[PDB]
Design a protein around this nucleic acid. Structure first.
Lengths: 86, 500, 205
RNA sequence: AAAUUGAAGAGUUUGAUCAUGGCUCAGAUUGAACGCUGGCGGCAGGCCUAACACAUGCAAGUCGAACGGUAACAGGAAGAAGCUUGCUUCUUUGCUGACGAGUGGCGGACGGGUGAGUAAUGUCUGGGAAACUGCCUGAUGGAGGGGGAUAACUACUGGAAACGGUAGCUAAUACCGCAUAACGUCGCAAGACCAAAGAGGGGGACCUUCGGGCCUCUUGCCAUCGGAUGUGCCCAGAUGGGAUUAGCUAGUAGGUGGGGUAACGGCUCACCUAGGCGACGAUCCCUAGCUGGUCUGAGAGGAUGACCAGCCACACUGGAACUGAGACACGGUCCAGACUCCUACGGGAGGCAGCAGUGGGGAAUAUUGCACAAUGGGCGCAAGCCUGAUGCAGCCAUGCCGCGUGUAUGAAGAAGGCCUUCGGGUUGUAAAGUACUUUCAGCGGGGAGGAAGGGAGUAAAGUUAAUACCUUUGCUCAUUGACGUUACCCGCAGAAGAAGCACCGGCUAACUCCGUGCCAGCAGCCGCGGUAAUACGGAGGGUGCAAGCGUUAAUCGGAAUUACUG
């Protein structure tokens, strides 16, 4: 970049990018564990997995990695499905 | 005003026959050595470079000596306070060097000289002194006040003496200038740039400058946007001594002229336009005379065939100078003329200029514009740029030499004698022949002669042997011939066929 | 921006006195008043309908010292204004300062009055107005400023003025060299061999 | 009170006529150009062409009151001395006024440029419902206790440069756990789950580890529900032409369910139904940013979309997402393309449709200027710093408006020119002469306003333990204008420095002589030119405009000549 701060911003945005990426990848992992339990038909594994997932979709919302509404749908959606089976 | 007198750095020019290592003297002092780093190995351009050396300050200017640069050496002499003439003991005196002698005396500029080669054993100073003794210029210790210097120019040997003479020669004469006042001077060389715009290299006689000051060069006017000095990209102030490239002028001025700054631009607008009117009035005047001079509707003879050329050179100094040398190669037979000499590069209206009348488009130094390539590539034309003027002056001549179409005589293809004429309805006659030499052909012209004088002339229409009607007949083979518009066939005459 | 040439030519072309000289002289002893200027002045113009309209507009313009652009703009304003356009044109002309200065007798001619104005010799409401076309309003007081009061042109100008018909809508004190634009002149105040409707016709076609 | 209360026709077909019908003119208008000419000023306008390419400067920073900090300069200091004993120079130490480089915060999504693309994820009018929304704002509560890092820096090392490699080492409002957790999110509910950060100003007992504790106020941080502003989304109508384009469509149209977004939605995927669009113009092709408005017209219309303002779209070309409240980013990143610059040859760098400026194209369009003083934007508690936004200045008669280039007097009415039947007519009161004025330009002298604020003190209130500090409001003192030689006013000199352009046969205001002789030439239309040419060219005279005047280009008018009105 040409301007002093523009240079600095590219550096900061890359750091943030690697920070966000790391936390975001983690989060989707814990979401995916729940969908995987559901697809195997286990209430407990899927409830257990939902309980681990809950606090982290909530936290990443508070931290701006995602919006509150996204966290809610995930909880709403998974909760809907797990109940529909056991 | 104020009549303030301050000393200045002397402006010096150097002249000679090409090859006295005139450039080497400057580059060694400048500790640059740009020589032989450029195309051609010689300096085809003019430039001024100021250096700082004890004692005081001095600047150097140089112009190449060639048959072609009649104007540059003439203007460079009158501008400089001191002129230097390089001479070699091996070269001695040459017709280009004596040409530089006249420029020194006619400009009433004092002259000091230097012997270029002390290195070569076959080179001696005494030869130079005595042979140039005959000419009133360059006396030594005869009471003619002129001093000779002996330098290596390669060795880098002093020099100490030459430098001293130059400082002294400028010291002995009163140096007159002023630090503040109305700026004025002359233009060294002008050219055109793409980003920067039209620019000029200007020696300022009275040294003063400012970004806000209005400057008027010739019939061109404008405000200075920026100032550049040699390598230095920007200079705030410029004195009467050191030269500074000027920028921001309306258009590319004349190759050289007197430049004067003014207080306001509005007052200088009418003056600049006034000079254009006179230059335009004489332009139409010289146009009417040359056309009416013949006093006839056409040329009295067959020299009417001519060649046209289109020239745009990056520098303004060349187009006027080399054209004069380009008119030297002109001859009565083939006439060559320049059309639309440009200040730089190439343009749409220039390519259009070569489109109307067939011509070669050449430039001392030029590059093709994006809009220029489209036109040149589409229609059939020729784009050729030449680093040196010598390669140009040779090929234009070449273009001219080719233009000529002279046949001064041809070589007989075959010679045949005719005997026992026969009658034909179509051609009226068929003359039986026997080829004694060569091969007879159909469409090649023939010369019919009797007793060494030519009875008739023509070109064969039908070559026929028997009923074969072959297009070719060798020697010592029976052959037959007939032609239209030939009434009388007599034996003993010989027909001479010749190729063209 | 001003007509600077011979003046009686204008009167001679329009067929009438345009008051372009002081009036000290019978105009017929200064020029051949009843003959147009030029080689062919004696010739009569068998004059077209357009011609009579043109000459009438020229006449009024030449009286007041107005060139075409400004005068056309005067028509435009007269038209825009309420009431009869032809009469509005003459109100606007007659309200000009160079004009009013002339009518109070401070200048022998409108040309002279205009020079008085331009040369900062005239005040309006004790305030210096130096542009000729300044529109003067009811109750305004225009005066010769103190320094210009001893100019002999002005005394002579007031003498001649005293010998012209005296305008109703102006109250002039010759001693003080001040005067008051009481009201806009009516149509009936102004000469009756001006044909405004012709000028109105010229500018509507 | 007033505020669309407005409308013209002429020449030219014919021997002549009436009708038909086209061509042409008078008018307004212009971002104009060219030709001749050119004094001043105020206000405006100024690449319409190549969304062609761009050298150089400048156009986005700021905060030490978040943080480790010193390298510059500035003081200060135990202690070195300049020592001529209070003046001091340098060795030192961030002690502090400040501040390069660094982390961090907020801004680089605004301001400014352009109109390429787009006949619709556009615009205009009018409505909807499923949403987010930095800074500013109201409400109610938090602001507890910890942890591992890292740039800078240090050491070693690679590069021509750009910029790197190792290992050390350290701070925070950088970063992450843990606690706390509802009028929040999920859930019928029971329950389950989510955050944070300090930094400054001043200070009375009181005292220590002299750091501060503690007292107090300012400010920032977290949560939730609002306000305001901004933005996303959906529907209807309108918004160019072409059928010498009539059929178009597989995410296509809908349904179910999963996923997805801030949010509704074929947004996406699977499955199912077989629909959906189209002569009320789909599809395809050409062209084009839309509007307020602008020009013209009595109007209805016609033409149009510079300058100002609103919306959209773009940022070298094609594609992409990252950061962020906001971007798929005008001076950010990545890939590919076109192109250019640097290089020590191994490798690097850049994108003016920001402001100046350059080349190129063109009939044609400006200075590489001054200033943040004013308004407004970014950061900061502030002081202030930045701001080619903006305010101004330069250039060009490009346009609009104003003014000047003198005023008055001046006759047998001169000389000269021009016409003349040689009587005289004209140029012409024009000139000369005579008085007289002095705008503008020139030169000196003086001198508003655009300035509100901000700075020291002071006093009062609200604060509080407090007269501190903070903040508000009065007081005084000294100050802030790029323009600028400002506007404007006074003085001096003299008519002194300031008039050109087109036209004069009819249309059409303005007539004669000489030259030419179907030539040279004119010509908007008719039509002029072969011996009297008011039509060519010169002259005298005249007409119309006037710092302009003509010619060319261009829209509408007249044209009821696309006729809805008609």
């Amino acid at each position: 970049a040409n301007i002093k701060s523009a240079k600095k911003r590219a550096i900061q945005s890359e750091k943030a990018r690697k920070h966000n990426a790391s936390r975001r990848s983690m989060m989707r992992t814990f979401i995916k564990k729940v969908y995987a339990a559901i697809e195997a038909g286990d209430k407990a594994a899927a409830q257990k997995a939902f309980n681990e997932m809950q606090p982290i979709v909530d936290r990443q919302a508070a931290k701006g990695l995602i919006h509150k509404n996204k966290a809610a749908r995930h909880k709403a959606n998974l909760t809907a499905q797990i109940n529909k089976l056991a | 005003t104020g009549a303030a007198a301050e000393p200045r750095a002397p402006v010096v020019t150097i002249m000679g026959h090409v090859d006295h290592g005139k450039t080497s003297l400057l580059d060694y002092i400048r500790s640059t050595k740009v020589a032989s780093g450029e195309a051609g190995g010689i300096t085809q351009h003019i430039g001024a470079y100021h250096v700082e050396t004890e004692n005081g300050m001095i600047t150097f200017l140089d112009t190449p000596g060639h048959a072609a640069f009649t104007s540059m050496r003439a203007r460079g002499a009158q501008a400089t306070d001191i002129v230097v003439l390089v001479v070699a003991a091996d070269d001695g005196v040459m017709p280009q060097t004596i040409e530089a002698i006249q420029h020194a005396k006619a400009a009433q500029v004092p002259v000091v000289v230097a012997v270029n080669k002390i290195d070569k054993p076959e080179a001696d100073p005494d030869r130079v002194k005595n042979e140039l003794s005959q000419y009133g210029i360059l006396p030594e210790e005869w009471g003619g006040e002129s001093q000779f210097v002996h330098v290596s120019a390669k060795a880098g040997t002093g020099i100490d003496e030459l430098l001293d003479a130059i400082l002294l020669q400028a010291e002995v004469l009163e140096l007159k200038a002023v630090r503040k006042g109305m700026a004025s001077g002359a233009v060294i060389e002008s050219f055109l740039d793409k980003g920067r715009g039209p620019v000029a290299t200007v020696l300022v006689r009275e040294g003063t400058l400012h970004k806000g000051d209005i400057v008027l060069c010739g019939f061109e006017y404008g405000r200075v946007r920026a100032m550049r000095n040699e390598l230095g990209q920007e200079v705030l102030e410029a004195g009467p001594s050191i030269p500074v490239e000027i920028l921001g002028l309306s258009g590319v001025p004349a190759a050289g002229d007197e430049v004067t700054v003014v207080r306001d631009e509005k007052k200088a607008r009418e003056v600049a336009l006034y000079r254009q009117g006179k230059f335009r009035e004489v332009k139409l005047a010289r146009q009417q005379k040359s056309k009416l001079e013949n006093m006839f509707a056409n040329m009295t003879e067959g020299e009417v065939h001519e060649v046209n050329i289109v020239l745009k050179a990056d520098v303004q100094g060349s187009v006027e100078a080399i054209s004069d040398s380009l008119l030297k190669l002109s001859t009565d037979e083939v006439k060559v003329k320049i059309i639309g000499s440009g200040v730089g590069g190439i343009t749409e209206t220039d390519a259009t200029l070569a489109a109307a009348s067939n011509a070669i488009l050449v430039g001392f130094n030029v590059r093709a514009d994006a809009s220029a390539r489209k036109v040149i590539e589409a229609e059939s034309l020729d784009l050729r740029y030449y680093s040196v003027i010598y390669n140009l002056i040779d090929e234009v001549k070449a273009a001219m030499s080719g233009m000529l179409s002279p046949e001064l005589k041809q070589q007989i293809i075959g010679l045949a004698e005719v005997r026992d004429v026969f009658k034909s309805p179509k051609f009226g006659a068929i003359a039986g022949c026997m080829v004694t030499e060569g091969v007879v052909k159909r469409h090649n012209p023939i010369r019919v002669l009797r007793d060494n004088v030519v009875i008739y002339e023509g070109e064969l229409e039908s070559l026929r042997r028997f009923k074969d009607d072959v297009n070719e007949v060798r020697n010592g083979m029976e052959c037959g011939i007939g032609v239209k518009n030939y009434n009388d066939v007599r034996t003993g005459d010989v027909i001479e066929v010749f190729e063209i | 921006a001003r007509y600077l040439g011979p003046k009686l030519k204008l009167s001679r072309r329009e067929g009438t006195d345009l008051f372009l000289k002081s009036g000290v002289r019978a105009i017929d002893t200064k020029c051949k008043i009843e003959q147009a200027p030029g080689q062919h002045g004696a010739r009569k113009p068998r004059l077209s309908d357009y011609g009579v309209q043109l000459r009438e507009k020229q006449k009024v313009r030449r009286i007041y010292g107005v060139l075409e652009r400004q005068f056309r703009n005067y028509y435009k304003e007269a038209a825009r204004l309420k009431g009869n356009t032809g009469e509005n044109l003459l109100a606007l002309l007659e309200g000009r300062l160079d004009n009013v200065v002339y009518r109070m007798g401070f200048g022998a001619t409108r040309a002279e009055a205009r020079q008085l104005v331009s040369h900062k010799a005239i005040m309006v409401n004790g305030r210096v107005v130096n542009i000729a076309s300044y529109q003067v309003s009811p109750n305004d007081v225009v005066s010769i400023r103190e320094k210009a009061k001893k100019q002999s042109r002005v005394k002579a100008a007031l003498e001649l003025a005293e010998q012209r018909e005296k305008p109703t809508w102006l109250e002039v004190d010759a001693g003080k060299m001040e005067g008051t634009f009481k009201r806009k002149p009516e149509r009936s105040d102004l000469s009756a061999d001006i044909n405004e409707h012709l000028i109105v016709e010229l500018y509507s076609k």
